[PDB]
A paper describes a structure:
We adopted the Z domain of staphylococcal protein A and its affibody binder dimer complex as a model system. We next generated libraries at the interface of a weakly associating dimer (Z+ ZSPA-1) with micromolar affinity to determine if we could affinity-mature the interface by coevolution. To clarify these inter-residue co-variations discovered from the sequence data, we determined crystal structures of 10 coevolved pairs that spanned a range of cross-reactivities and orthogonalities (5 from LL1 and 5 from LL2). From the structures, we could verify clear compensatory changes between the residues showing the most significant covariations (13A-9B / 17A-31B) in both LL1 and LL2 library mutants.
Residue numbers in the entry:
A (entry chain A), B (entry chain B): 0 to 58
Write the structure that this text describes.
């Protein structure tokens, strides 16, 4: 099921992590590698990335 | 090392796709997933994306 929760969360994490503007290059690459290594962790990885993005907003 | 040529090349091409302002979200998602699955397609996908972006410019 290409549209089940697992797969939608994986695709969405790739797409949304690619968008997050306040990740640096190394951090972004680490998230992508983590997604590839364990797609079951996609929603958790996205949540982690979004928090980090907000922590690293210009101030 | 996760901060490598593979993740960098994906990140650079993917960011070029998603920063094209006139694409819709489904087009950008589909291009990004194709890139994820087949890096050999990067130049092809970037060129298709740019052609669609120009065609969908505001009127």
């Amino acid at each position: 099921a290409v549209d089940n929760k697992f797969n939608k969360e994986f695709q969405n994490a790739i797409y949304e992590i690619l968008h997050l503007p306040n990740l640096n290059e190394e951090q972004r690459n680490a998230f992508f590698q983590s997604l590839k290594d364990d797609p079951s962790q996609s929603a958790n990885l996205l949540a982690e990335a979004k928090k980090l993005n907000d922590a690293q907003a210009p101030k």
